[PDB]
Amino acid sequence: ITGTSTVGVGRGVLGDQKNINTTYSTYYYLQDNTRGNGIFTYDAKYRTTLPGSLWADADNQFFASYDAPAVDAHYYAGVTYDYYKNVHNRLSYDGNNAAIRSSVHYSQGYNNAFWNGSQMVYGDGDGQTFIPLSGGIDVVAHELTHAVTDYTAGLIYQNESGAINEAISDIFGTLVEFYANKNPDWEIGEDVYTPGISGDSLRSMSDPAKYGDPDHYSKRYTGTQDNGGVHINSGIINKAAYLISQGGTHYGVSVVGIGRDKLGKIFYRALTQYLTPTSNFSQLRAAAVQSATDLYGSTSQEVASVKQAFDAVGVK
Numbered sequence: 001i002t003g004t005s006t007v008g009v010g011r012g013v014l015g016d017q018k019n020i021n022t023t024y025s026t027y028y029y030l031q032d033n034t035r036g037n038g039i040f041t042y043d044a045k046y047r048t049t050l051p052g053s054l055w056a057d058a059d060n061q062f063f064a065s066y067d068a069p070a071v072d073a074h075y076y077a078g079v080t081y082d083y084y085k086n087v088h089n090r091l092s093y094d095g096n097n098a099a100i101r102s103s104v105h106y107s108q109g110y111n112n113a114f115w116n117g118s119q120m121v122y123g124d125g126d127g128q129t130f131i132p133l134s135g136g137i138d139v140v141a142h143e144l145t146h147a148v149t150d151y152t153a154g155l156i157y158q159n160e161s162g163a164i165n166e167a168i169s170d171i172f173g174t175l176v177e178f179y180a181n182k183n184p185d186w187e188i189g190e191d192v193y194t195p196g197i198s199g200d201s202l203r204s205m206s207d208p209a210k211y212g213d214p215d216h217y218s219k220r221y222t223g224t225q226d227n228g229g230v231h232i233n234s235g236i237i238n239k240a241a242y243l244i245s246q247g248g249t250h251y252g253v254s255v256v257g258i259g260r261d262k263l264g265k266i267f268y269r270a271l272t273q274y275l276t277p278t279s280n281f282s283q284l285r286a287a288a289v290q291s292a293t294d295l296y297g298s299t300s301q302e303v304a305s306v307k308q309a310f311d312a313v314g315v316k
């Protein structure tokens with residue numbers, strides 16, 4: 001990890017070639033010195049001990065199929081870092097250029113990725129439900145957005161707070177996907193979910209109900225599974241964010257879209273200035289309204305659209 005900065009080349013999960021920032025010191029390591037205090041990618045070697053070994057490669061070429069998840073975790077973490085820096089003027093997830101660490105090849109057949117409070121972790125999937133999860137830029141950015149949330153609002157991962165936490169990760173995962181401008185959509189995980197099946201995804205922001213997730217507060221899940229429905233009730237907020245950006249009429253309520261850039265600015269402000277660990281949906285609405293008010297004025301279209309969107313999904 002002390003060495004010379006260089007640039008290697010490899011192929012990612014989906015077979016695309018990309019340049020990656022590496023560090024040379026006997027081996028070439030997946031250590032990007034160009035961004036903050038660095039982006040580091042580790043090999044968990046099919047175990048669950050973390051972080052594993054800093055990824056070392058003999059020739060700075062990453063075309064082996066074992067390499068692909070590392071390439072994409074390393075690259076997409078850099079893209080995510082760039083999004084936050086360039087769009088929101090935020091230096092890494094803590095605002096002080098904290099090193100970003102990811103481990104790939106976690107466990108065997110593991111159909112998930114997560115932020116664990118210290119680092120990102122990516123399974124390879126079982127090859128049927130998922131292919132390696134770092135192949136999805138929205139997934140990567142979703143996970144690194146959990147780190148942002150943890151250092152800012154600190155939304156507890158349960159019940160309504162947790163659903164907001166999840167939605168924020170989907171929202172910013174999608175915004176990063178649009179920033180990178182590679183096949184962007186309002187779906188989550190499409191690139192890595194069900195390689196056998198075209199056109200599906202893990203979750204939809206444009207139509208959460210496509211996969212049985214609620215799109216109105218009246219349909220919220222009230223039981224105990226999934227920490228009180230954090231991945232289920234996120235759909236209510238996701239739909240609201242989609243409406244703020246894109247517009248539409250939902251349960252008879254019409255929303256004029258204000259676009260993705262303003263969506264991002266409003267929700268970033270809400271997250272960093274107004275939300276707290278125990279914020280519920282009604283407080284999110286208030287925070288988003290206040291944020292839009294701060295940015296655009298109390299009689300703006302932007303404020304009106306935020307109100308309309310939350311009315312559309314039944315959040316007062």
Ligand SMILES: [Ca+2]
Nearest residue numbers: 057059061062
């Ligand atoms: Ca190599």
Ligand SMILES: [Ca+2]
Nearest residue numbers: 064065066067
């Ligand atoms: Ca091997």
Ligand SMILES: [Ca+2]
Nearest residue numbers: 183184185190
């Ligand atoms: Ca996409």
Ligand SMILES: [Ca+2]
Nearest residue numbers: 138187188189
């Ligand atoms: Ca997507």
Ligand SMILES: [Ca+2]
Nearest residue numbers: 193194195197
């Ligand atoms: Ca699929």
Ligand SMILES: [Zn+2]
Nearest residue numbers: 142146166169
């Ligand atoms: Zn999440």
